[PDB]
């Protein structure tokens, strides 16, 4: 829902979505190749 939303807000009015009470399948993130920048701070991406 967050990644494939058709409309994204502007940077000055950035939209914030809270994600909780769910199981997070990160495999879609690694499988996706459209991503150009993937930097993680304070956590190993393989350890996510």
């Amino acid at each position: 829902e967050v990644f494939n939303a058709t409309r994204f807000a502007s940077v000055y009015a950035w939209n914030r979505k809270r994600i909780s009470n769910c199981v997070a399948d990160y495999s879609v993130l690694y499988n996706s190749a459209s991503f150009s920048t993937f930097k993680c701070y304070g956590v190993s991406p393989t350890k996510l």
Epitope: S27, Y30, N31, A33, T37, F38, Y41, G42, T46
Partner: antibody, heavy 122, light 110 residues
């Protein structure tokens, strides 16, 4: 363009502390992580820790968590590594270098390396 | 801690021949089709220079003779042809999980 400069050699008495400088130039210093790798003469390479100049976030190896303390100087674009409780086994060559850390890119690929500094503990 | 073993410890290869350096991982390195194994060349008295990243991609500026291969817990670095200036120690590094470790190194002799 991109240059990482280190002193040729450093001499420190056993049990003392030594401070290190890794001057960075030719690139945006705060956008690239800096790490230090220990190489004993005649041995392989050993990771010490990872630090991000932007915000000062630090990651330390469990073996070197109490031996090495890592700081940054964004004003001078210089990375600082401090070793305490130096002993005879700490005499090695440490290299400072930068990686882009992009998962869909190089990730932990370490393209460029600093010249390194050798320390004699006696 | 993933332990990387490099064989052979010393390799002698003449001009125009093929040199293969194999790095064995104690644990799996592949992660969703990505193998986090890096190859470096360290000339004596100099810092290591990156050759292969992700165990399959050649770094820019490196001659096409250097090539990487392997998957799962076994990876090999192939140099063909081998030139005179190839005398150095080659190290393999893994980055799937912390702490990142380096192999014992393979010394190449002409």
């Amino acid at each position: 363009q991109v240059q990482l400069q280190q002193p040729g050699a450093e001499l420190v008495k056993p049990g003392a502390s030594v401070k290190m400088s890794c001057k960075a130039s030719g690139y945006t210093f705060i956008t690239y992580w800096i790490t230090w790798v220990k190489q004993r003469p005649g041995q392989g390479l050993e990771w010490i820790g990872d630090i991000y100049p932007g915000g000062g976030r630090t990651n330390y190896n469990e073996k070197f968590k109490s031996k090495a303390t890592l700081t940054v100087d964004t004003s001078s674009s210089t990375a600082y590594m401090q070793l305490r409780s130096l002993t005879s086994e700490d005499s090695a060559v440490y290299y400072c270098a930068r990686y882009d850390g992009n998962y869909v890119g190089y990730y932990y690929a370490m393209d460029y390396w600093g010249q390194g500094t050798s320390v004699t503990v006696s | 801690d993933i332990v990387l073993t490099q064989s052979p410890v010393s390799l002698a290869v003449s001009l125009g021949q093929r040199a293969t350096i194999s790095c064995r991982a104690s644990e799996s390195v592949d992660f969703y089709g990505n193998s986090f194994i890096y190859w470096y060349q360290q000339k004596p008295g100099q810092a290591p220079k990156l050759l292969i990243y992700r165990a399959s991609n050649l770094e820019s500026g490196i001659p096409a003779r250097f090539s990487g291969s392997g998957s799962r817990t076994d990876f090999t670095l192939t140099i063909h042809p081998v030139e005179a200036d190839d005398v150095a120690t080659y190290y393999c590094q893994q980055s799937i999980e912390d702490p990142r470790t380096f192999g014992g190194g393979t010394k190449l002799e002409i």
